Amino acid sequence: FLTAVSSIDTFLPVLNEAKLQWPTSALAASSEELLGGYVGSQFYLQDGKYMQFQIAGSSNRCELRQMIPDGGSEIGWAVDDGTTHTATSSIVVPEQVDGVEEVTIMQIHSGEAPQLRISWIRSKSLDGVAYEDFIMSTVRIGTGDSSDNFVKTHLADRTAGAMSFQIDVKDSKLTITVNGNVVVNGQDLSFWDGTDSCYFKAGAYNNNPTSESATARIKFAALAWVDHHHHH
Ligand SMILES: O=C(O)[C@H]1O[C@@H](O[C@H]2[C@H](O)[C@H](O)[C@H](O[C@H]3[C@H](O)[C@H](O)[C@@H](O)O[C@@H]3C(=O)O)O[C@@H]2C(=O)O)[C@@H](O)[C@@H](O)[C@@H]1O
Ligand SMILES: O=C(O)[C@H]1O[C@@H](O[C@H]2[C@H](O)[C@H](O)[C@H](O[C@H]3[C@H](O)[C@H](O)[C@H](O)O[C@@H]3C(=O)O)O[C@H]2C(=O)O)[C@@H](O)[C@@H](O)[C@@H]1O
Ligand SMILES: [Cl-]
């Protein structure tokens, strides 16, 4: 039988602050249900150690969405509220099966748009450089479709071993740290000033596959939203 993520202590803090959306943004499991042992092939404990997400289908997801802690409702915060908002993770990205082309593994999202997606990418050129099998950040600085609305950055080549990420937002600026090294340093998020509906996400969100049957798979060794105010 499949082992539940809540059967160990590692992920209990974030599970107390998230709902699971699967296979779309529809509710699969509340925070209470996650803490109570919700499990399926889409969301189970691998190797006694990893919170593993799996999903097939274009634009489908198996993803945690940040909630107010202790049974609360959906959270919404602003890039310019003066608080530092932080998400941390340690992720093992396996080799992806044929047909999977991009898997979003962490986000900042709002009611209307993704401010930030960190994604694995099979193949893409950025600023005239071709990259394969790598982790990318995609930041929106507008809501349009033209390339001027996005800042897309190579973060790191995918590693077999765990890779650490940290996302920080403070005073309308974004920092992304990968394996302890700052890769994105103070990216401007001020376009989003006053949007009070932002939240963190993490898991597997499958983008532009070439086969809707192909199953994306992502293993988390750690995941947390870090509260700089220590509300207790
Ligand atoms: O390599 C490129 O720059 C390609 O960008 C394509 O447009 C992207 C866009 O930059 C961005 O990555 C966007 O991301 C969306 C995501 O895939 C999901 O649909 C959801 O999260 O919404 C995201 C968003 O709207 O920000 O996806 C588009 C896209 O549809 O591919 C094109 O410009 C492409 O021609 C170009 O090669
Ligand atoms: O286009 C998407 O799939 C976006 O969905 C976003 O989640 C929303 C979405 O409305 C979703 O259906 C669900 O809606 C909830 C909503 O949270 C509301 O507050 C209440 O919980 O009932 C609604 C419902 O059950 O329909 O959750 C929403 C949310 O903001 O959490 C995100 O998953 C986006 O990332 C996505 O692009
Ligand atoms: Cl799409």
JSON list of N, CA and C in Angstrom, two decimals, residues 157-229:
[
{"chain": "A", "resi": 157, "resn": "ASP", "atom": "N", "xyz": [21.52, 23.68, -13.91]},
{"chain": "A", "resi": 157, "resn": "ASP", "atom": "CA", "xyz": [21.27, 22.41, -14.57]},
{"chain": "A", "resi": 157, "resn": "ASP", "atom": "C", "xyz": [20.63, 21.46, -13.56]},
{"chain": "A", "resi": 158, "resn": "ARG", "atom": "N", "xyz": [19.72, 20.61, -14.04]},
{"chain": "A", "resi": 158, "resn": "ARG", "atom": "CA", "xyz": [19.12, 19.63, -13.14]},
{"chain": "A", "resi": 158, "resn": "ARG", "atom": "C", "xyz": [20.20, 18.70, -12.60]},
{"chain": "A", "resi": 159, "resn": "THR", "atom": "N", "xyz": [20.13, 18.41, -11.30]},
{"chain": "A", "resi": 159, "resn": "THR", "atom": "CA", "xyz": [21.03, 17.45, -10.68]},
{"chain": "A", "resi": 159, "resn": "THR", "atom": "C", "xyz": [20.28, 16.18, -10.28]},
{"chain": "A", "resi": 160, "resn": "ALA", "atom": "N", "xyz": [21.01, 15.07, -10.25]},
{"chain": "A", "resi": 160, "resn": "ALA", "atom": "CA", "xyz": [20.41, 13.85, -9.75]},
{"chain": "A", "resi": 160, "resn": "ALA", "atom": "C", "xyz": [20.06, 13.99, -8.29]},
{"chain": "A", "resi": 161, "resn": "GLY", "atom": "N", "xyz": [20.92, 14.65, -7.52]},
{"chain": "A", "resi": 161, "resn": "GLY", "atom": "CA", "xyz": [20.70, 14.81, -6.10]},
{"chain": "A", "resi": 161, "resn": "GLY", "atom": "C", "xyz": [19.81, 16.00, -5.79]},
{"chain": "A", "resi": 162, "resn": "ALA", "atom": "N", "xyz": [19.42, 16.06, -4.52]},
{"chain": "A", "resi": 162, "resn": "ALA", "atom": "CA", "xyz": [18.56, 17.14, -4.05]},
{"chain": "A", "resi": 162, "resn": "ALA", "atom": "C", "xyz": [19.18, 18.50, -4.35]},
{"chain": "A", "resi": 163, "resn": "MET", "atom": "N", "xyz": [18.32, 19.45, -4.71]},
{"chain": "A", "resi": 163, "resn": "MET", "atom": "CA", "xyz": [18.69, 20.83, -4.99]},
{"chain": "A", "resi": 163, "resn": "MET", "atom": "C", "xyz": [17.85, 21.71, -4.07]},
{"chain": "A", "resi": 164, "resn": "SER", "atom": "N", "xyz": [18.49, 22.62, -3.35]},
{"chain": "A", "resi": 164, "resn": "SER", "atom": "CA", "xyz": [17.77, 23.51, -2.46]},
{"chain": "A", "resi": 164, "resn": "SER", "atom": "C", "xyz": [17.37, 24.79, -3.18]},
{"chain": "A", "resi": 165, "resn": "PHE", "atom": "N", "xyz": [16.17, 25.27, -2.86]},
{"chain": "A", "resi": 165, "resn": "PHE", "atom": "CA", "xyz": [15.63, 26.52, -3.36]},
{"chain": "A", "resi": 165, "resn": "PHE", "atom": "C", "xyz": [15.15, 27.36, -2.19]},
{"chain": "A", "resi": 166, "resn": "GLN", "atom": "N", "xyz": [15.30, 28.68, -2.33]},
{"chain": "A", "resi": 166, "resn": "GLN", "atom": "CA", "xyz": [14.63, 29.60, -1.44]},
{"chain": "A", "resi": 166, "resn": "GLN", "atom": "C", "xyz": [14.12, 30.78, -2.27]},
{"chain": "A", "resi": 167, "resn": "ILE", "atom": "N", "xyz": [12.86, 31.13, -2.06]},
{"chain": "A", "resi": 167, "resn": "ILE", "atom": "CA", "xyz": [12.21, 32.28, -2.67]},
{"chain": "A", "resi": 167, "resn": "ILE", "atom": "C", "xyz": [11.95, 33.28, -1.57]},
{"chain": "A", "resi": 168, "resn": "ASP", "atom": "N", "xyz": [12.41, 34.52, -1.75]},
{"chain": "A", "resi": 168, "resn": "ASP", "atom": "CA", "xyz": [12.12, 35.61, -0.83]},
{"chain": "A", "resi": 168, "resn": "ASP", "atom": "C", "xyz": [11.51, 36.78, -1.59]},
{"chain": "A", "resi": 169, "resn": "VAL", "atom": "N", "xyz": [10.44, 37.34, -1.04]},
{"chain": "A", "resi": 169, "resn": "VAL", "atom": "CA", "xyz": [9.85, 38.57, -1.54]},
{"chain": "A", "resi": 169, "resn": "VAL", "atom": "C", "xyz": [9.81, 39.56, -0.39]},
{"chain": "A", "resi": 170, "resn": "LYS", "atom": "N", "xyz": [10.38, 40.74, -0.61]},
{"chain": "A", "resi": 170, "resn": "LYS", "atom": "CA", "xyz": [10.28, 41.82, 0.37]},
{"chain": "A", "resi": 170, "resn": "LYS", "atom": "C", "xyz": [10.35, 43.14, -0.38]},
{"chain": "A", "resi": 171, "resn": "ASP", "atom": "N", "xyz": [9.46, 44.06, -0.01]},
{"chain": "A", "resi": 171, "resn": "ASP", "atom": "CA", "xyz": [9.47, 45.41, -0.56]},
{"chain": "A", "resi": 171, "resn": "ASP", "atom": "C", "xyz": [9.53, 45.38, -2.09]},
{"chain": "A", "resi": 172, "resn": "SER", "atom": "N", "xyz": [8.67, 44.57, -2.68]},
{"chain": "A", "resi": 172, "resn": "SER", "atom": "CA", "xyz": [8.49, 44.50, -4.13]},
{"chain": "A", "resi": 172, "resn": "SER", "atom": "C", "xyz": [9.71, 43.97, -4.87]},
{"chain": "A", "resi": 173, "resn": "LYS", "atom": "N", "xyz": [10.57, 43.20, -4.20]},
{"chain": "A", "resi": 173, "resn": "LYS", "atom": "CA", "xyz": [11.73, 42.60, -4.84]},
{"chain": "A", "resi": 173, "resn": "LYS", "atom": "C", "xyz": [11.78, 41.11, -4.53]},
{"chain": "A", "resi": 174, "resn": "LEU", "atom": "N", "xyz": [12.25, 40.36, -5.51]},
{"chain": "A", "resi": 174, "resn": "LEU", "atom": "CA", "xyz": [12.32, 38.91, -5.46]},
{"chain": "A", "resi": 174, "resn": "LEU", "atom": "C", "xyz": [13.77, 38.45, -5.48]},
{"chain": "A", "resi": 175, "resn": "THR", "atom": "N", "xyz": [14.11, 37.53, -4.58]},
{"chain": "A", "resi": 175, "resn": "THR", "atom": "CA", "xyz": [15.40, 36.86, -4.59]},
{"chain": "A", "resi": 175, "resn": "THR", "atom": "C", "xyz": [15.18, 35.35, -4.63]},
{"chain": "A", "resi": 176, "resn": "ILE", "atom": "N", "xyz": [15.95, 34.67, -5.47]},
{"chain": "A", "resi": 176, "resn": "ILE", "atom": "CA", "xyz": [15.93, 33.21, -5.58]},
{"chain": "A", "resi": 176, "resn": "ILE", "atom": "C", "xyz": [17.34, 32.71, -5.31]},
{"chain": "A", "resi": 177, "resn": "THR", "atom": "N", "xyz": [17.46, 31.81, -4.34]},
{"chain": "A", "resi": 177, "resn": "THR", "atom": "CA", "xyz": [18.71, 31.20, -3.94]},
{"chain": "A", "resi": 177, "resn": "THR", "atom": "C", "xyz": [18.63, 29.71, -4.27]},
{"chain": "A", "resi": 178, "resn": "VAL", "atom": "N", "xyz": [19.66, 29.19, -4.94]},
{"chain": "A", "resi": 178, "resn": "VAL", "atom": "CA", "xyz": [19.70, 27.80, -5.40]},
{"chain": "A", "resi": 178, "resn": "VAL", "atom": "C", "xyz": [20.98, 27.19, -4.86]},
{"chain": "A", "resi": 179, "resn": "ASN", "atom": "N", "xyz": [20.86, 26.10, -4.11]},
{"chain": "A", "resi": 179, "resn": "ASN", "atom": "CA", "xyz": [22.00, 25.46, -3.46]},
{"chain": "A", "resi": 179, "resn": "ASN", "atom": "C", "xyz": [22.87, 26.47, -2.71]},
{"chain": "A", "resi": 180, "resn": "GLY", "atom": "N", "xyz": [22.22, 27.44, -2.06]},
{"chain": "A", "resi": 180, "resn": "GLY", "atom": "CA", "xyz": [22.91, 28.40, -1.22]},
{"chain": "A", "resi": 180, "resn": "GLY", "atom": "C", "xyz": [23.49, 29.60, -1.95]},
{"chain": "A", "resi": 181, "resn": "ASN", "atom": "N", "xyz": [23.34, 29.67, -3.27]},
{"chain": "A", "resi": 181, "resn": "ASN", "atom": "CA", "xyz": [23.90, 30.74, -4.08]},
{"chain": "A", "resi": 181, "resn": "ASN", "atom": "C", "xyz": [22.76, 31.59, -4.63]},
{"chain": "A", "resi": 182, "resn": "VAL", "atom": "N", "xyz": [22.85, 32.90, -4.45]},
{"chain": "A", "resi": 182, "resn": "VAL", "atom": "CA", "xyz": [21.82, 33.78, -4.99]},
{"chain": "A", "resi": 182, "resn": "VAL", "atom": "C", "xyz": [21.98, 33.81, -6.49]},
{"chain": "A", "resi": 183, "resn": "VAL", "atom": "N", "xyz": [20.92, 33.43, -7.20]},
{"chain": "A", "resi": 183, "resn": "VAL", "atom": "CA", "xyz": [20.91, 33.44, -8.65]},
{"chain": "A", "resi": 183, "resn": "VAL", "atom": "C", "xyz": [20.08, 34.59, -9.20]},
{"chain": "A", "resi": 184, "resn": "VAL", "atom": "N", "xyz": [18.93, 34.86, -8.59]},
{"chain": "A", "resi": 184, "resn": "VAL", "atom": "CA", "xyz": [18.14, 36.04, -8.91]},
{"chain": "A", "resi": 184, "resn": "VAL", "atom": "C", "xyz": [18.21, 36.98, -7.72]},
{"chain": "A", "resi": 185, "resn": "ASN", "atom": "N", "xyz": [18.72, 38.18, -7.94]},
{"chain": "A", "resi": 185, "resn": "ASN", "atom": "CA", "xyz": [19.04, 39.11, -6.86]},
{"chain": "A", "resi": 185, "resn": "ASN", "atom": "C", "xyz": [18.17, 40.36, -7.04]},
{"chain": "A", "resi": 186, "resn": "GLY", "atom": "N", "xyz": [17.09, 40.45, -6.29]},
{"chain": "A", "resi": 186, "resn": "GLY", "atom": "CA", "xyz": [16.29, 41.67, -6.28]},
{"chain": "A", "resi": 186, "resn": "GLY", "atom": "C", "xyz": [15.56, 41.98, -7.57]},
{"chain": "A", "resi": 187, "resn": "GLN", "atom": "N", "xyz": [14.99, 40.97, -8.22]},
{"chain": "A", "resi": 187, "resn": "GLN", "atom": "CA", "xyz": [14.12, 41.20, -9.37]},
{"chain": "A", "resi": 187, "resn": "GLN", "atom": "C", "xyz": [12.93, 42.06, -8.98]},
{"chain": "A", "resi": 188, "resn": "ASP", "atom": "N", "xyz": [12.63, 43.04, -9.82]},
{"chain": "A", "resi": 188, "resn": "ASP", "atom": "CA", "xyz": [11.53, 43.96, -9.55]},
{"chain": "A", "resi": 188, "resn": "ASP", "atom": "C", "xyz": [10.18, 43.25, -9.71]},
{"chain": "A", "resi": 189, "resn": "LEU", "atom": "N", "xyz": [9.36, 43.32, -8.66]},
{"chain": "A", "resi": 189, "resn": "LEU", "atom": "CA", "xyz": [7.97, 42.85, -8.67]},
{"chain": "A", "resi": 189, "resn": "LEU", "atom": "C", "xyz": [6.98, 44.00, -8.50]},
{"chain": "A", "resi": 190, "resn": "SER", "atom": "N", "xyz": [7.44, 45.24, -8.63]},
{"chain": "A", "resi": 190, "resn": "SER", "atom": "CA", "xyz": [6.58, 46.38, -8.32]},
{"chain": "A", "resi": 190, "resn": "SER", "atom": "C", "xyz": [5.38, 46.49, -9.25]},
{"chain": "A", "resi": 191, "resn": "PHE", "atom": "N", "xyz": [5.40, 45.84, -10.42]},
{"chain": "A", "resi": 191, "resn": "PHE", "atom": "CA", "xyz": [4.19, 45.81, -11.23]},
{"chain": "A", "resi": 191, "resn": "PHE", "atom": "C", "xyz": [3.01, 45.30, -10.42]},
{"chain": "A", "resi": 192, "resn": "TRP", "atom": "N", "xyz": [3.28, 44.39, -9.47]},
{"chain": "A", "resi": 192, "resn": "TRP", "atom": "CA", "xyz": [2.26, 43.74, -8.68]},
{"chain": "A", "resi": 192, "resn": "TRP", "atom": "C", "xyz": [1.93, 44.48, -7.40]},
{"chain": "A", "resi": 193, "resn": "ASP", "atom": "N", "xyz": [2.46, 45.69, -7.20]},
{"chain": "A", "resi": 193, "resn": "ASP", "atom": "CA", "xyz": [2.18, 46.43, -5.98]},
{"chain": "A", "resi": 193, "resn": "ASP", "atom": "C", "xyz": [0.67, 46.57, -5.82]},
{"chain": "A", "resi": 194, "resn": "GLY", "atom": "N", "xyz": [0.19, 46.31, -4.61]},
{"chain": "A", "resi": 194, "resn": "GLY", "atom": "CA", "xyz": [-1.22, 46.45, -4.30]},
{"chain": "A", "resi": 194, "resn": "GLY", "atom": "C", "xyz": [-2.07, 45.23, -4.59]},
{"chain": "A", "resi": 195, "resn": "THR", "atom": "N", "xyz": [-1.55, 44.24, -5.31]},
{"chain": "A", "resi": 195, "resn": "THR", "atom": "CA", "xyz": [-2.26, 42.98, -5.49]},
{"chain": "A", "resi": 195, "resn": "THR", "atom": "C", "xyz": [-2.17, 42.19, -4.19]},
{"chain": "A", "resi": 196, "resn": "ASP", "atom": "N", "xyz": [-3.29, 42.01, -3.49]},
{"chain": "A", "resi": 196, "resn": "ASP", "atom": "CA", "xyz": [-3.27, 41.40, -2.17]},
{"chain": "A", "resi": 196, "resn": "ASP", "atom": "C", "xyz": [-3.68, 39.93, -2.18]},
{"chain": "A", "resi": 197, "resn": "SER", "atom": "N", "xyz": [-3.55, 39.25, -3.32]},
{"chain": "A", "resi": 197, "resn": "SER", "atom": "CA", "xyz": [-4.02, 37.88, -3.49]},
{"chain": "A", "resi": 197, "resn": "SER", "atom": "C", "xyz": [-2.88, 36.90, -3.80]},
{"chain": "A", "resi": 198, "resn": "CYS", "atom": "N", "xyz": [-1.63, 37.26, -3.53]},
{"chain": "A", "resi": 198, "resn": "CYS", "atom": "CA", "xyz": [-0.52, 36.36, -3.83]},
{"chain": "A", "resi": 198, "resn": "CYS", "atom": "C", "xyz": [-0.42, 35.25, -2.80]},
{"chain": "A", "resi": 199, "resn": "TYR", "atom": "N", "xyz": [0.15, 34.13, -3.23]},
{"chain": "A", "resi": 199, "resn": "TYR", "atom": "CA", "xyz": [0.37, 32.98, -2.36]},
{"chain": "A", "resi": 199, "resn": "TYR", "atom": "C", "xyz": [1.46, 32.11, -2.98]},
{"chain": "A", "resi": 200, "resn": "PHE", "atom": "N", "xyz": [2.04, 31.25, -2.15]},
{"chain": "A", "resi": 200, "resn": "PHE", "atom": "CA", "xyz": [2.99, 30.27, -2.64]},
{"chain": "A", "resi": 200, "resn": "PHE", "atom": "C", "xyz": [2.29, 28.98, -3.08]},
{"chain": "A", "resi": 201, "resn": "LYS", "atom": "N", "xyz": [2.94, 28.27, -4.01]},
{"chain": "A", "resi": 201, "resn": "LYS", "atom": "CA", "xyz": [2.56, 26.92, -4.40]},
{"chain": "A", "resi": 201, "resn": "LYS", "atom": "C", "xyz": [3.82, 26.08, -4.58]},
{"chain": "A", "resi": 202, "resn": "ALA", "atom": "N", "xyz": [3.66, 24.76, -4.47]},
{"chain": "A", "resi": 202, "resn": "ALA", "atom": "CA", "xyz": [4.77, 23.87, -4.81]},
{"chain": "A", "resi": 202, "resn": "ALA", "atom": "C", "xyz": [4.21, 22.48, -5.08]},
{"chain": "A", "resi": 203, "resn": "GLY", "atom": "N", "xyz": [4.87, 21.76, -5.97]},
{"chain": "A", "resi": 203, "resn": "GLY", "atom": "CA", "xyz": [4.46, 20.41, -6.32]},
{"chain": "A", "resi": 203, "resn": "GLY", "atom": "C", "xyz": [4.86, 20.11, -7.75]},
{"chain": "A", "resi": 204, "resn": "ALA", "atom": "N", "xyz": [3.89, 19.70, -8.56]},
{"chain": "A", "resi": 204, "resn": "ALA", "atom": "CA", "xyz": [4.11, 19.41, -9.97]},
{"chain": "A", "resi": 204, "resn": "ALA", "atom": "C", "xyz": [2.95, 19.96, -10.77]},
{"chain": "A", "resi": 205, "resn": "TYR", "atom": "N", "xyz": [3.24, 20.87, -11.67]},
{"chain": "A", "resi": 205, "resn": "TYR", "atom": "CA", "xyz": [2.25, 21.49, -12.54]},
{"chain": "A", "resi": 205, "resn": "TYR", "atom": "C", "xyz": [2.79, 21.37, -13.96]},
{"chain": "A", "resi": 206, "resn": "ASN", "atom": "N", "xyz": [2.08, 20.61, -14.80]},
{"chain": "A", "resi": 206, "resn": "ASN", "atom": "CA", "xyz": [2.60, 20.10, -16.06]},
{"chain": "A", "resi": 206, "resn": "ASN", "atom": "C", "xyz": [2.27, 21.05, -17.20]},
{"chain": "A", "resi": 207, "resn": "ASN", "atom": "N", "xyz": [3.29, 21.62, -17.84]},
{"chain": "A", "resi": 207, "resn": "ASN", "atom": "CA", "xyz": [3.11, 22.67, -18.83]},
{"chain": "A", "resi": 207, "resn": "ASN", "atom": "C", "xyz": [3.52, 22.19, -20.21]},
{"chain": "A", "resi": 208, "resn": "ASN", "atom": "N", "xyz": [2.64, 22.36, -21.19]},
{"chain": "A", "resi": 208, "resn": "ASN", "atom": "CA", "xyz": [2.93, 22.07, -22.59]},
{"chain": "A", "resi": 208, "resn": "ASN", "atom": "C", "xyz": [3.56, 20.70, -22.87]},
{"chain": "A", "resi": 209, "resn": "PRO", "atom": "N", "xyz": [3.00, 19.62, -22.32]},
{"chain": "A", "resi": 209, "resn": "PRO", "atom": "CA", "xyz": [3.50, 18.30, -22.69]},
{"chain": "A", "resi": 209, "resn": "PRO", "atom": "C", "xyz": [3.15, 18.01, -24.14]},
{"chain": "A", "resi": 210, "resn": "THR", "atom": "N", "xyz": [3.87, 17.06, -24.73]},
{"chain": "A", "resi": 210, "resn": "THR", "atom": "CA", "xyz": [3.52, 16.59, -26.07]},
{"chain": "A", "resi": 210, "resn": "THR", "atom": "C", "xyz": [2.73, 15.30, -26.04]},
{"chain": "A", "resi": 211, "resn": "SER", "atom": "N", "xyz": [2.55, 14.72, -24.87]},
{"chain": "A", "resi": 211, "resn": "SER", "atom": "CA", "xyz": [1.65, 13.60, -24.68]},
{"chain": "A", "resi": 211, "resn": "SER", "atom": "C", "xyz": [0.89, 13.86, -23.39]},
{"chain": "A", "resi": 212, "resn": "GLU", "atom": "N", "xyz": [-0.44, 13.81, -23.46]},
{"chain": "A", "resi": 212, "resn": "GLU", "atom": "CA", "xyz": [-1.22, 14.05, -22.26]},
{"chain": "A", "resi": 212, "resn": "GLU", "atom": "C", "xyz": [-1.20, 12.86, -21.32]},
{"chain": "A", "resi": 213, "resn": "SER", "atom": "N", "xyz": [-0.70, 11.72, -21.77]},
{"chain": "A", "resi": 213, "resn": "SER", "atom": "CA", "xyz": [-0.59, 10.54, -20.93]},
{"chain": "A", "resi": 213, "resn": "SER", "atom": "C", "xyz": [0.71, 10.51, -20.12]},
{"chain": "A", "resi": 214, "resn": "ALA", "atom": "N", "xyz": [1.70, 11.33, -20.48]},
{"chain": "A", "resi": 214, "resn": "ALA", "atom": "CA", "xyz": [3.02, 11.30, -19.85]},
{"chain": "A", "resi": 214, "resn": "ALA", "atom": "C", "xyz": [2.98, 11.86, -18.43]},
{"chain": "A", "resi": 215, "resn": "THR", "atom": "N", "xyz": [3.53, 11.11, -17.47]},
{"chain": "A", "resi": 215, "resn": "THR", "atom": "CA", "xyz": [3.41, 11.46, -16.06]},
{"chain": "A", "resi": 215, "resn": "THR", "atom": "C", "xyz": [4.66, 12.17, -15.55]},
{"chain": "A", "resi": 216, "resn": "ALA", "atom": "N", "xyz": [4.50, 13.45, -15.23]},
{"chain": "A", "resi": 216, "resn": "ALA", "atom": "CA", "xyz": [5.51, 14.21, -14.53]},
{"chain": "A", "resi": 216, "resn": "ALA", "atom": "C", "xyz": [5.63, 13.71, -13.09]},
{"chain": "A", "resi": 217, "resn": "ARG", "atom": "N", "xyz": [6.85, 13.77, -12.54]},
{"chain": "A", "resi": 217, "resn": "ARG", "atom": "CA", "xyz": [7.10, 13.22, -11.20]},
{"chain": "A", "resi": 217, "resn": "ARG", "atom": "C", "xyz": [8.18, 14.05, -10.52]},
{"chain": "A", "resi": 218, "resn": "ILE", "atom": "N", "xyz": [7.89, 14.53, -9.32]},
{"chain": "A", "resi": 218, "resn": "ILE", "atom": "CA", "xyz": [8.80, 15.43, -8.59]},
{"chain": "A", "resi": 218, "resn": "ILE", "atom": "C", "xyz": [8.83, 14.99, -7.13]},
{"chain": "A", "resi": 219, "resn": "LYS", "atom": "N", "xyz": [10.03, 14.90, -6.54]},
{"chain": "A", "resi": 219, "resn": "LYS", "atom": "CA", "xyz": [10.21, 14.45, -5.16]},
{"chain": "A", "resi": 219, "resn": "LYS", "atom": "C", "xyz": [10.73, 15.59, -4.29]},
{"chain": "A", "resi": 220, "resn": "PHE", "atom": "N", "xyz": [10.00, 15.92, -3.23]},
{"chain": "A", "resi": 220, "resn": "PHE", "atom": "CA", "xyz": [10.44, 16.93, -2.28]},
{"chain": "A", "resi": 220, "resn": "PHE", "atom": "C", "xyz": [11.05, 16.26, -1.05]},
{"chain": "A", "resi": 221, "resn": "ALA", "atom": "N", "xyz": [12.29, 16.62, -0.74]},
{"chain": "A", "resi": 221, "resn": "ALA", "atom": "CA", "xyz": [12.90, 16.24, 0.53]},
{"chain": "A", "resi": 221, "resn": "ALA", "atom": "C", "xyz": [12.54, 17.20, 1.65]},
{"chain": "A", "resi": 222, "resn": "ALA", "atom": "N", "xyz": [12.12, 18.42, 1.31]},
{"chain": "A", "resi": 222, "resn": "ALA", "atom": "CA", "xyz": [11.74, 19.43, 2.29]},
{"chain": "A", "resi": 222, "resn": "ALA", "atom": "C", "xyz": [10.90, 20.47, 1.57]},
{"chain": "A", "resi": 223, "resn": "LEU", "atom": "N", "xyz": [9.97, 21.09, 2.30]},
{"chain": "A", "resi": 223, "resn": "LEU", "atom": "CA", "xyz": [9.18, 22.20, 1.77]},
{"chain": "A", "resi": 223, "resn": "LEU", "atom": "C", "xyz": [8.62, 22.96, 2.96]},
{"chain": "A", "resi": 224, "resn": "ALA", "atom": "N", "xyz": [8.72, 24.29, 2.94]},
{"chain": "A", "resi": 224, "resn": "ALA", "atom": "CA", "xyz": [8.12, 25.09, 4.01]},
{"chain": "A", "resi": 224, "resn": "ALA", "atom": "C", "xyz": [7.83, 26.50, 3.53]},
{"chain": "A", "resi": 225, "resn": "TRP", "atom": "N", "xyz": [6.79, 27.10, 4.12]},
{"chain": "A", "resi": 225, "resn": "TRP", "atom": "CA", "xyz": [6.63, 28.54, 4.09]},
{"chain": "A", "resi": 225, "resn": "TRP", "atom": "C", "xyz": [7.17, 29.06, 5.41]},
{"chain": "A", "resi": 226, "resn": "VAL", "atom": "N", "xyz": [8.12, 29.99, 5.36]},
{"chain": "A", "resi": 226, "resn": "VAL", "atom": "CA", "xyz": [8.81, 30.45, 6.57]},
{"chain": "A", "resi": 226, "resn": "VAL", "atom": "C", "xyz": [8.21, 31.78, 7.01]},
{"chain": "A", "resi": 227, "resn": "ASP", "atom": "N", "xyz": [7.60, 31.81, 8.19]},
{"chain": "A", "resi": 227, "resn": "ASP", "atom": "CA", "xyz": [6.93, 33.01, 8.69]},
{"chain": "A", "resi": 227, "resn": "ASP", "atom": "C", "xyz": [7.93, 33.86, 9.46]},
{"chain": "A", "resi": 228, "resn": "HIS", "atom": "N", "xyz": [8.23, 35.05, 8.95]},
{"chain": "A", "resi": 228, "resn": "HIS", "atom": "CA", "xyz": [9.18, 35.93, 9.61]},
{"chain": "A", "resi": 228, "resn": "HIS", "atom": "C", "xyz": [8.60, 36.64, 10.82]},
{"chain": "A", "resi": 229, "resn": "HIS", "atom": "N", "xyz": [7.31, 36.49, 11.10]},
{"chain": "A", "resi": 229, "resn": "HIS", "atom": "CA", "xyz": [6.71, 37.14, 12.25]},
{"chain": "A", "resi": 229, "resn": "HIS", "atom": "C", "xyz": [6.47, 36.20, 13.43]}
]
